[PDB]
Amino acid sequence: SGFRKMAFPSGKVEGCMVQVTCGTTTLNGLWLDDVVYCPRHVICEDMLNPNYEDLLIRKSNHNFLVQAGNVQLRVIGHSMQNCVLKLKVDTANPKTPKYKFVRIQPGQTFSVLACYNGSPSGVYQCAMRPNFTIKGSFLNGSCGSVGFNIDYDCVSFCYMHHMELPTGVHAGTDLEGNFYGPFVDRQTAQAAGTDTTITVNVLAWLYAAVINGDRWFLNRFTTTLNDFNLVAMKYNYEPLTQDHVDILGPLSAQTGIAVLDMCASLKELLQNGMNGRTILGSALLEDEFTPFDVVRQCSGVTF
Amino acid sequence: SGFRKMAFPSGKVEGCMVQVTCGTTTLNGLWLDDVVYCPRHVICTSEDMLNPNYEDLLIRKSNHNFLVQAGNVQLRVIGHSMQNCVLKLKVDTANPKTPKYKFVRIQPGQTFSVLACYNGSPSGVYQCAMRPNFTIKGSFLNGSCGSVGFNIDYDCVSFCYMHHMELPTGVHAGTDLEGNFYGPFVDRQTAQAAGTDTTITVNVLAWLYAAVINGDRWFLNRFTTTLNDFNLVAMKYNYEPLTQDHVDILGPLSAQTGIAVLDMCASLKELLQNGMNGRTILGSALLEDEFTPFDVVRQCSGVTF
Numbered sequence: 385s386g387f388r389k390m391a392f393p394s395g396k397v398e399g400c401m402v403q404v405t406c407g408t409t410t411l412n413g414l415w416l417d418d419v420v421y422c423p424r425h426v427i428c429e430d431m432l433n434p435n436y437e438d439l440l441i442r443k444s445n446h447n448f449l450v451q452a453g454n455v456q457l458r459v460i461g462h463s464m465q466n467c468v469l470k471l472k473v474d475t476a477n478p479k480t481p482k483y484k485f486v487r488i489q490p491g492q493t494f495s496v497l498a499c500y501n502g503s504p505s506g507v508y509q510c511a512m513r514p515n516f517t518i519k520g521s522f523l524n525g526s527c528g529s530v531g532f533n534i535d536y537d538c539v540s541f542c543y544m545h546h547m548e549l550p551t552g553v554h555a556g557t558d559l560e561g562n563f564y565g566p567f568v569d570r571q572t573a574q575a576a577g578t579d580t581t582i583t584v585n586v587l588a589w590l591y592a593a594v595i596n597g598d599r600w601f602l603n604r605f606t607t608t609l610n611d612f613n614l615v616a617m618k619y620n621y622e623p624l625t626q627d628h629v630d631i632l633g634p635l636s637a638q639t640g641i642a643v644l645d646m647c648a649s650l651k652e653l654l655q656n657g658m659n660g661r662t663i664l665g666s667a668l669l670e671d672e673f674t675p676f677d678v679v680r681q682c683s684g685v686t687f
Numbered sequence: 688s689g690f691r692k693m694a695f696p697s698g699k700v701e702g703c704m705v706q707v708t709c710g711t712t713t714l715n716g717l718w719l720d721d722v723v724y725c726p727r728h729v730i731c732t733s734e735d736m737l738n739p740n741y742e743d744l745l746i747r748k749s750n751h752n753f754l755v756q757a758g759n760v761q762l763r764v765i766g767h768s769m770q771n772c773v774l775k776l777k778v779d780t781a782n783p784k785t786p787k788y789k790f791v792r793i794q795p796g797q798t799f800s801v802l803a804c805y806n807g808s809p810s811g812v813y814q815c816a817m818r819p820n821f822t823i824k825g826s827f828l829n830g831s832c833g834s835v836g837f838n839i840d841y842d843c844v845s846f847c848y849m850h851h852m853e854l855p856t857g858v859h860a861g862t863d864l865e866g867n868f869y870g871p872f873v874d875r876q877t878a879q880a881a882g883t884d885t886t887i888t889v890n891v892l893a894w895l896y897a898a899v900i901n902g903d904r905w906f907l908n909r910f911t912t913t914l915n916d917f918n919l920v921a922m923k924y925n926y927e928p929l930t931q932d933h934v935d936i937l938g939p940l941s942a943q944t945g946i947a948v949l950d951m952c953a954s955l956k957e958l959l960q961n962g963m964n965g966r967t968i969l970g971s972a973l974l975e976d977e978f979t980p981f982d983v984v985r986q987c988s989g990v991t992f
């Protein structure tokens with residue numbers, strides 16, 4: 385019993401975190417094999433109009449200081465891929481885990497290992513919002529911190545932190561340097577778009593509540609997918625597709641509650657609220673657990 | 688900016704997790720130097736749990752009855768002893784991944800990270816608090832016994848909890864790493880129930896200071912209160928008494944935000960009376976009590992927005 389916001393164990397990622405310094409800027413790097421990956425803004429007034437290829441051509445290998453624990457790594461090459469800088473080093477990381485670089489979709493969740501000066505300070509779980517921002521917890525020096533999932537023994541790196549938006553939310557790239565969302569790496573007027581609630585995730589969390597013995601919100605009713613989407617569009621909820629209904633199939637079979645029957649429960653919660661009650665210790669409808677997170681936490685999958 | 692329930696990086700603890708088997712029971716062990724620590728109920732059958740005599744059950748065991756597996760390697764048990772509710776298995780290999788560590792006993796209200804494990808394999812990490820009734824609201828399934836709670840302030844891992852059991856309400860009970868239970872619990876299948884739980888007041892106040900640091904002040908008022916009047920109101924909402932120690936501990940956050948502790952107490956009294964009126968504080972519609980004053984200072988910026 386119990387339901388917590390759970391992150392993947394961070395050990396395989398901790399052994400990859402390094403500190404990258406270029407001039408006055410210090411941030412975090414990810415050391416995998418003989419390459420250190422970090423945000424290209426480490427090379428830098430310069431952030432007003434940054435022609436990164438022009439600023440990079442002036443740099444030499446010895447300008448980049450890379451520190452792994454108390455050891456200085458020697459940079460022997462450098463190249464840029466989109467918004468990520470790749471620093472070739474003389475030493476392959478002996479703690480490099482089995483890994484992949486994967487690009488995630490809005491609604492998908494991941495663990496963030498927040499770092500400062502190449503030293504990991506915390507781990508938390510979060511989701512890629514529909515507006516492509518993440519509601520993270522980051523201070524100055526956190527740039528280069530990474531987001532990941534673990535599938536079996538393989539670490540799938542999906543996010544690298546680049547910047548904070550004026551609303552306190554965060555923006556970043558996949559490990560190939562492509563931003564999530566319409567963001568750019570420079571100081572200019574940028575804002576997160578209007579956000580929406582991840583419907584398939586709220587439904588998964590309602591199934592998790594039923595599994596843990598919370599059934600007060602269940603009713604005898606059902607709805608069509610079209611009628612549910614017309615109602616959900618009124619409350620800034622993402623449309624629920626037939627794919628979402630299929631993905632919720634296992635949880636529907638385990639609890640005996642059809643997806644469109646759980647949709648009717650959700651419709652009543654949106655139109656009437658919780659009436660002083662809570663679900664899994666929360667007075668808000670939680671959207672940062674995917675159907676797979678619910679099945680994994682209510683089954684005990686190990687790494 | 689932002690405020691999340693943040694756990695410590697779990698790597699230093701992952702390298703200590705092992706699987707301990709005795710007969711039909713399999714659970715988790717903590718391998719530090721040449722000793723494996725695990726719940727003593729690993730020697731019990733389910734029948735034994737009603738009224739187990741652990742000394743009687745343990746004297747019948749020999750070293751080779753305990754199977755210890757670290758990854759794919761079988762560790763050889765060369766000794767065994769019981770200390771309170773923890774079994775200590777002396778093994779022939781010291782753990783090369785043993786971090787710098789201490790065993791610390793925490794008080795209610797303290798927070799810690801839990802590395803939930805099954806079959807000696809870590810599956811997840813989450814942050815939680817020792818409730819005033821000495822239980823923890825964890826997320827544990829069958830096989831999680833032996834999973835540990837810890838803090839990592841600097842390079843040293845402070846082990847504070849080892850998981851032993853789930854109570855009938857779905858909450859969890861366990862011991863410090865010396866085998867002493869938190870709360871009036873026993874590692875027996877006896878009718879035990881968690882006492883009535885209360886809200887950790889000093890933690891809610893810390894979280895209100897975290898909200899002010901992150902730029903939110905909607906909940907503040909022009910009033911102050913005496914400590915006695917605040918406690919008379921708070922105990923009506925099942926909140927723990929706020930002591931002078933709590934007021935002292937909140938001193939640094941009071942100085943950083945410019946809001947006196949008894950002035951923040953007055954705002955808490957008003958929130959308890961009015962609710963949030965459709966508003967949230969740090970993305971929550973409930974008053975959060977699982978962040979200590981120390982956690983707020985660790986996570987939040989030193990510059991108030």
Ligand SMILES: O=C(Cc1cccc(Cl)c1)Nc1cncc2ccc(C(=O)O)cc12
Nearest residue numbers: 425522523524526546547548569570571688
């Ligand atoms: O956003 C930036 C730097 C920046 C600026 C312009 C363009 C890019 Cl790509 C990056 N850094 C920060 C990241 N995460 C949290 C922060 C919290 C605070 C601050 C700060 O300096 O106040 C800074 C943060």
Ligand SMILES: O=C(Cc1cccc(Cl)c1)Nc1cncc2ccc(C(=O)O)cc12
Nearest residue numbers: 385728736827828829851852853874875876
């Ligand atoms: O409580 C026990 C074993 C036990 C029984 C009696 C007394 C003691 Cl000291 C220990 N196991 C479990 C622990 N943590 C979560 C569980 C979740 C589920 C179950 C289960 O068996 O279904 C079991 C859990």
Ligand SMILES: [Cl-]
Nearest residue numbers: 792793794797
């Ligand atoms: Cl303590």
